[PDB]
Design a protein around this nucleic acid. Structure first.
Ligand SMILES: [Mg+2]
Ligand SMILES: [Zn+2]
Ligand SMILES: [Zn+2]
Ligand SMILES: [Zn+2]
Lengths: 48, 469, 66, 50, 49, 50, 49, 258, 115, 47, 47, 299
RNA sequence: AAAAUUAGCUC
């Protein structure tokens, strides 16, 4: 899932590729059609 | 000359026309409206209704010039309209200049939201909680589940279909692979074990196979050449040659080293007979503690490297017991508190004992009237004998009409009925509210969370107990 | 995946009514009429035939051999 | 005890009673201090050894 | 892919179901899906304050 | 720490506010060290034999 | 292999969906026909300006 | 300081359900007889399934579960057999159980429908419900699959599990007019009259009655098909009588010992 | 995993007494009967029958805990009528009543069939 | 006038007695019914 | 004298595979094969 | 029968049946009379029930209340009033607080146990529930609510007209836009309050929402008002819905439409469903709430 | 009796 080179993996993004959650058809669909913002996790701001 | 994805934005206030063609521009289709009237006339509807017989499809509509993809950056400069007829006939002059008109308002919802019946009758937080909890519902996740060897696959025995389905989920494919059962839910406080967000299930219902699901767990293991002298191989580790060995039964598996299918297993039991030569060390995997399953099938093959690679999956019949986490389609999560036998559950004038009993106090604080509407319409649909509709914005489904229908079957127009104290047989002074309603079962079983410890294994760095069940 | 054997709430045998219900729907009847033609009075037992999904067919498509 | 221990009334002693099924139980009145909700909560249980 | 526009018959014969949406890679025998990331549109002037 | 347990919780009004409904598995798994004494040597003897 | 059951189920499904389509159309025409009066408490719609 | 002289009157006797009425009896007795109908009624049912070869598409336990729910006619056999727990022999003796065998294999191309008719019982009278209306569908087999097993049946009652639950649904109801006010209708006019209501269509509910005790209990026991309804009633009465007799004996022994 | 078996609700365990008498001390002529492996079925009818009897000042049962298969019946009679004989009389008359009801039901059925 | 500050709104009534000044004038706000003293200015709420 | 019979993946034909042997079907030739059910006393209670 | 049965669920019953409040024509006990036996020792405390009209102590009937309020306990025996959270909940001078302060801690533990074990066993006979029947109005309250909402809409339109023609003078300390927004918000809040009051006064004693709210167990008058009368304004960041697009909330509405529905005012109620636009705005409000919850938990 | 790391879910 590290969208970058192996040597500098930590410098690249994380979670870009995830394991498809095959727990129930609805979950599969939701997963295949999901988004994710690059903003840092748990940011103090609340506009985004 | 211009594909349908391109977008032209006209900036009036400042004379700038900005056209975008690059990818990613999220967009959606809308109907066109020339002056006050749609381009989607009966001709188009007729030709389209005969689709799947000749060749007619969406592309025909897009080409004919009736629909049109507007991207968000262009959506800011179009006087959209909600429904064709209602917002155009003739009234106080609001805008009278619409340019497009949405297909159906309910099409804003997503995938997990859409299966929520009457979402507009619930407070948004509960809709969101339901959206998240839907992804945790059990059922048939894929038809060819018996061929998959995935890890942690749940499957439900009798996944019925919702008695009330939204028109949108017809295309979500939910009705072919449902994730819940229609249960006769009675909102009331029978005994007390369902007071703070908890439910009382019917022991007899469970005995009959109410929500009875199954739990699979796959395993992956292959042999490899550890080193010039080190090497792994499948073989029953005997009591003499193998120095490293566990204090567990090994004869349970056959000589080949792979436990045969349909064999009772329990926690801390050998599932694969891997031994590595140093004489040999028992470097073999065991079933996780507190699993207690039965072996479904054993798969053996060769990986890319060409070594013997085998996969084993164990199934487990998970009877619904107390502590299991259920949830309706409205965010009314809860955990089965206690289970009563049919003799003890209350009953209507006829032998209809509720299958689930939620707390009444869960309704007012959370404002989930949508749940009540679902229950009423479900009772009506059951009696009539056909699935009812719960599309979000319908303008033709109110409570008064649904009640009027229900009153034509000898039932209180509001859905309440007179129950009988299961124990003594005395009527209940208050008229309980009982009806069909679609309930799910989450994967959060109790047996997967219960844990204990008394001087267990210790870490190597700081001599403190380990972490994780 | 297959029609249950008994109604969860009531207990009346309903497993032996799936083929009959399908036949009645096929010939001419409608659901609301077929259900009472089979003799399912209580609305608790009707959800068995209305809501039940028939996945065993899809399962049988994956014939092991031949 | 319940995992978020905000204030003193979040770790109180109790007398043990063993019951068949596999779930911690506790009188509802004692729910308010812990802030538990019986909607899939988890509550730790330590035992002294002296 | 090998199932491009293939009838449900062959899919069933290939131990696959016609309902599977698809659109997910198979690495090391795991279903990997790419989450659509989002960012600021390029080649457009923004005036922040 | 050892001698810890974590399980879901459910209401149970028939128990007093100071009681707690532990399961059977957890009860069996944990232990309490008790000093032998002639006042209760018989009880511990029976427990050991069991 | 699918001559019985597997084919009868498809036949019943197709006829039932056709019956549902005609049922919906008749319900629509009936709703249009019975346009005498509509006085209901539990329903409302916005009216700006 | 003694009991009462209840009367009984059947209104509808069929081979599928019985509707009767009990008058001059206490509510506790009525509801207790109900709970005995549902819970404590001896009946035969499959309880031990040994599966030898199952190539169907359902689980191994799915077959056993379903087979647990197939009713078995026990009109005159339940009274004779003894609970397996109290048997004085090893293995399921025929004196204390009824053996079943099933062996089906889909050879032809058309899918099989393994129905309860495949359960070849050893005893003549203990058979699933097919004597005199399709049969309970167990599982569907496709060419090449097979299902071989044998199961034994034993006597139980609903209290232990649902499989021993002879009654489909007991309709118990008393005082159809809300004469004792045991329920308070916020709007009595809105409620539909009970099937047993003698009250005319004008009035909504009978006038209050202070010195009024519940009598005239209406029953609609509905047999699942295992036992005949009147047989269910007789068995429930006999079982309750036996439980009281045993309790009285135990109390007598306890008092004498003291 | 810790689900108790289904036979523990009605079948006695070795050493457990079916019925235990325990005299109370707070008021004269008051005993608590404790019944193992029973439910409301066998306690409610006895409670009602004791209520019918006029010499019984107090009568009531309870279930200490639903998961436990046990019930306690409290009986308190006039000083000249011990609660034991009250219990015996209640059960005896209740058995007589059920037998009479069975006989009447049987005759009613046999008359209903072609009659 | 413009420099001033707008007075806090509320339903003035004399049905509530302020415990800080003994006066009956005060204003109530429903949302729990908060009470603000009119002259004394006692602040309280009723559930 | 048990040669650890296996079931081919797609052929659904039995095969005799012993230790230190390639895992392939006697015919066609595939790399997948499952095992056969045990012979133990698989006894369930229809509960 | 019921009195003797409930007594069985009492760990501190002395064993004596209290004299029934009504000997003839038939021995009938009262709820308060039974509940007294639960109260331990000789406690004394005074409390006011939730629905206690303020203008009752001043007038006559101070010590004999028509509404059965003014909870008075003497020698640990309930005499008047209806117990609610104000008397049994967690509040200074609540009945349990007095019991703990006067009697020992164990006495208070027994008090709790007895209260629950008796009240649930009696609830078995009584029964509690909730359903559509408890959410429907009387078909006149709907008329009042519609009239009130129409008046509110007319008033906001008049305010907008005055602002457009430059007649609304800036309120002191605020700019013209600020005073305009303040007036609109006050008008909408007043309308919502009037509708809620009308809905409340239109309920019946048998209604279950009212029972749960007055008992204070779970809910509030605002919940009922939203369920029946009208949801209300959907604010974000302490203000009305902003203009995400160019000078307008959603593509449906026209530019410069400050009207109530064009800015978030959910005119419908949860029983009668929601128009799509107000549904979206309600979603925005819920999202704001969730974000605030997360940041609070983090900080 | 075994590592480093990331992600999802939950009160
Ligand atoms: Mg919670
Ligand atoms: Zn039913
Ligand atoms: Zn025998
Ligand atoms: Zn091969």
């Amino acid at each position: 899932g590290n969208w970058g080179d192996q040597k500098k993996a930590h410098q690249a993004r994380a979670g870009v590729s995830q394991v498809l959650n095959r727990l129930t058809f609805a979950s599969t669909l939701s997963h295949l059609r999901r988004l994710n913002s690059p903003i840092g996790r748990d940011g103090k701001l609340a506009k985004p | 000359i211009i594909v349908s994805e391109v977008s032209m934005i006209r900036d009036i206030r400042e004379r700038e026309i900005r056209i975008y063609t690059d990818a990613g521009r999220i967009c959606r289709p809308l109907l066109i409206v020339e002056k006050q009237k749609l381009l989607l006339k009966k001709r188009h509807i007729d030709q389209l209704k005969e689709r799947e017989y000749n060749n007619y499809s969406w592309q025909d509509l897009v080409a004919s010039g009736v629909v049109e993809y507007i991207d968000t950056l262009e959506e800011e400069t179009v006087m959209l309209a909600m429904t064709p007829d209602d917002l155009q006939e003739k009234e106080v002059a609001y805008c009278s200049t619409y340019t497009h008109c949405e297909i159906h308002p309910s099409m804003i919802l997503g995938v997990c939201a859409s299966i929520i019946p009457f979402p507009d009758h619930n407070q948004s937080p509960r809709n969101t909680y339901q959206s998240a909890m839907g992804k945790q519902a059990m059922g048939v996740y894929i038809t060819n589940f018996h061929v998959r060897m995935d890890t942690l696959a749940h499957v439900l025995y009798y996944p019925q279909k919702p008695l009330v389905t939204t028109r949108s989920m017809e295309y979500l494919r939910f009705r072919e692979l449902p994730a819940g059962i229609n249960s006769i839910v009675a909102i009331a406080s029978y005994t007390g074990y369902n007071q703070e967000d908890s439910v009382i299930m019917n022991r007899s219902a469970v005995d009959r196979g109410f929500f009875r699901s199954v739990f699979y767990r796959s395993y992956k293991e292959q042999e490899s050449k550890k080193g010039f002298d080190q090497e792994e191989v499948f073989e029953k580790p005997t009591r003499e040659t193998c120095q490293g060995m566990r204090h567990a039964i090994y004869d349970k598996l056959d000589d080949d080293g792979l436990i045969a299918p349909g064999v009772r297993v329990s926690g801390d039991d050998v599932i694969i007979g891997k031994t590595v030569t140093l004489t040999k060390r028992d470097c073999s995997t065991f079933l996780r503690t507190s699993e207690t399953g039965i072996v479904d099938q054993v798969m053996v093959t060769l990986n890319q490297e060409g070594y013997k690679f085998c996969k084993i999956r164990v199934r487990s019949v998970r009877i619904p017991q107390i502590g299991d986490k259920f949830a309706s389609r409205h965010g009314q999560k809860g955990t089965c508190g206690i289970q009563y036998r049919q003799e003890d559950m209350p009953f209507t004038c006829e032998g209809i004992t509720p299958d689930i009993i939620i707390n009444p106090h869960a309704i007012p604080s959370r404002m989930t009237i949508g749940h009540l509407i679902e229950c009423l319409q479900g009772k009506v649909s059951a009696n009539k004998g056909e699935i009812g509709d719960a599309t979000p914005f319908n303008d033709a489904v109110n409570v008064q009409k649904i009640s009027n229908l229900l009153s034509d079957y000898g039932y209180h127009l509001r859905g309440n009925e007179v129950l009988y104290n299961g124990f003594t047989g005395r009527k209940i002074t208050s008229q309980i509210f009982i009806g069909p309603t679609y309930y799910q079962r989450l994967k959060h079983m109790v047996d997967d969370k219960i844990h204990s410890r008394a001087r267990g294994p210790i870490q190597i760095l700081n001599r403190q107990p380990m972490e994780g069940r | 995946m297959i029609i249950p054997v008994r109604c969860f709430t009531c207990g009346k045998i309903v497993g032996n009514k799936w083929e009959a219900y399908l036949g009645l729907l096929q010939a001419e009847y409608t659901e609301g009429d077929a259900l009472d033609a089979l003799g399912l009075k209580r609305y608790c037992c009707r959800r068995m035939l209305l809501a039940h999904v028939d996945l065993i067919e899809k399962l049988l498509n994956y014939a092991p051999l031949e | 005890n319940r995992q978020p221990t905000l204030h003193k009334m979040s770790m109180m002693g109790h007398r043990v009673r063993i019951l068949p099924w596999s779930t911690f139980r506790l009188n509802l009145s004692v729910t308010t201090p812990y802030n538990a909700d019986f909607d899939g909560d988890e509550m730790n249980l330590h035992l002294p050894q002296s | 892919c090998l199932l491009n526009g293939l009838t449900d018959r062959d899919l069933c014969e290939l131990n696959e179901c016609p309902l599977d949406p698809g659109g997910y890679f198979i690495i090391n025998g795991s279903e990997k899906v790419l989450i659509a990331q989002e960012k600021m549109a390029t080649n457009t002037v923004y005036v922040f304050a | 720490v050892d001698f810890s347990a974590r399980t879901v919780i459910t209401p149970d009004p028939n128990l007093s506010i100071d009681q707690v409904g532990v399961p059977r598995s957890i009860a069996a798994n944990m232990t309490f060290a008790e000093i032998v004494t002639p006042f209760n040597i018989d009880r511990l003897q029976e427990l050991v034999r069991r | 292999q699918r001559t019985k059951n597997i084919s009868a189920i498809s036949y019943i499904n197709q006829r039932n969906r056709e019956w549902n389509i005609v049922e919906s159309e008749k319900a629509l025409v009936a709703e249009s026909h019975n346009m005498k009066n509509q006085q209901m408490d539990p329903f409302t719609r916005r009216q700006c300006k | 300081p003694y009991a009462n002289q209840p009367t009984v009157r059947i209104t509808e006797l069929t081979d599928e359900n019985v509707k009767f009425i009990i008058e001059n009896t206490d509510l506790a007795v009525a509801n207790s007889i109900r709970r005995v109908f549902i819970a404590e009624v001896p009946i035969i049912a499959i309880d031990w399934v040994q599966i030898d070869a199952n190539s169907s598409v359902l689980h191994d336990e799915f077959i056993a579960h379903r087979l647990g729910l197939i009713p078995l006619t026990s009109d005159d056999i339940v009274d004779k057999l003894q609970y397996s727990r109290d048997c004085t022999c090893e293995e399921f003796c025929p004196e204390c159980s009824v053996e079943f065998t099933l062996d089906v294999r889909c050879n032809e191309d058309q899918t099989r429908h393994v129905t309860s008719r495949d359960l070849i019982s050893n005893s003549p009278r203990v058979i699933p419900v097919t004597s005199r209306q399709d049969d309970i569908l167990i599982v569907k087999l496709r060419k090449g699959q097979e299902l071989r097993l044998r199961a034994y049946a034993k006597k139980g009652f609903g209290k232990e599990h649902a499989k021993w639950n002879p009654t489909a649904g007991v309709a118990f109801e008393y005082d159809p007019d809300n004469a004792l006010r045991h329920t308070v209708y916020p709007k009595p006019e809105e409620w539909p009259k009970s099937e047993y209501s003698e009250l005319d269509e004008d009035e909504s509910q009978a006038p209050y009655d202070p010195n009024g005790k519940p009598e005239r209990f209406y029953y609609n026991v509905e047999s699942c098909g295992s036992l005949r309804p009147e047989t269910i009633v007789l068995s429930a009465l006999s079982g309750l009588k036996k439980k009281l007799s045993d309790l009285q004996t135990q109390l007598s022994h306890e008092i004498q010992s003291d | 995993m810790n689900a108790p078996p289904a036979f523990e609700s009605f079948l006695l365990f070795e050493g457990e007494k079916k019925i235990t008498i325990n005299k109370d001390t707070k008021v004269p002529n008051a005993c608590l009967f404790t019944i193992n492996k029973e439910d409301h079925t066998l306690g409610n009818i006895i409670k009602s029958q004791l209520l019918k009897d006029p010499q019984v000042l107090f009568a009531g049962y309870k279930v200490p805990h639903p998961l436990e298969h046990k019930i306690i019946i409290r009986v308190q009679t006039t000083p000249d009528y011990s609660p034991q004989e009250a219990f015996t009389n209640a059960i005896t008359d209740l058995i007589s009543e059920l037998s009479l009801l069975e006989e009447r039901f049987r005759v009613a059925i046999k008359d209903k069939q072609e009659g | 006038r413009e420099h001033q500050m707008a007075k806090t709104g509320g339903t003035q009534t004399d049905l509530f007695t302020c415990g800080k000044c003994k006066k009956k004038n005060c204003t109530y706000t429903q949302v729990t019914t908060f009470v603000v003293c009119n002259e004394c200015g006692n602040r309280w709420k009723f559930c | 004298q048990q040669p650890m019979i296996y079931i081919c993946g797609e052929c659904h034909t039995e095969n005799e595979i012993k230790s230190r042997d390639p895992i392939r079907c006697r015919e066609c030739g595939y790399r997948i094969m499952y095992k056969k059910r045990t012979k133990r006393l698989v006894v369930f209670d229809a509960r | 029968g019921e009195v003797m049965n409930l007594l069985m669920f009492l760990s501190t019953w002395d064993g004596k049946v209290p004299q029934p409040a009504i000997l003839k024509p038939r021995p009938l006990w009262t709820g308060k009379q039974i509940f007294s036996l639960i109260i331990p020792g000789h406690i004394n405390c005074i409390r006011t029930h939730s629905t206690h009209p303020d203008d009752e102590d001043s007038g006559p009937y101070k010590h004999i209340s028509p509404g059965d309020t003014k909870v008075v306990v003497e020698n640990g025996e309930l005499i008047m009033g209806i117990l609610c959270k104000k008397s049994l909940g967690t509040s200074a001078g609540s009945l349990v607080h007095i019991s703990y302060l006067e009697m020992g801690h164990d006495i208070t533990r027994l008090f709790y146990s007895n209260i629950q074990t008796v009240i649930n066993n009696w609830l078995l006979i009584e029964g509690h529930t909730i359903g559509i029947g408890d959410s429907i109005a009387d078909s006149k309250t709907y008329q009042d609510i519609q009239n009130t909402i129409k008046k509110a809409k007319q008033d906001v339109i008049e305010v907008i007209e005055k602002a457009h023609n430059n007649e609304l003078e800036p309120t002191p300390g605020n700019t013209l836009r600020q005073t305009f927004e303040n007036q609109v918000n006050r008008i909408l809040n007043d309308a919502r309050d009037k509708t809620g009051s009308s809905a409340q006064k239109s309920l019946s004693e048998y209604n279950n929402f009212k029972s749960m709210v007055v008992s204070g167990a779970k809910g509030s008058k605002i919940n009922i008002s939203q369920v029946i009368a009208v949801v209300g304004q959907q604010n974000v960041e302490g203000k009305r819905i902003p203009f995400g697009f160019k000078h307008r909330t959603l593509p449906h509405f026209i530019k410069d439409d400050y009207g109530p529905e064009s800015r978030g005012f959910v005119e419908n109620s949860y029983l009668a469903g929601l128009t799509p636009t107000e549904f979206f705005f309600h979603a925005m409000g819920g999202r704001e709430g969730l974000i605030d919850t997360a940041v609070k938990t983090a900080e």
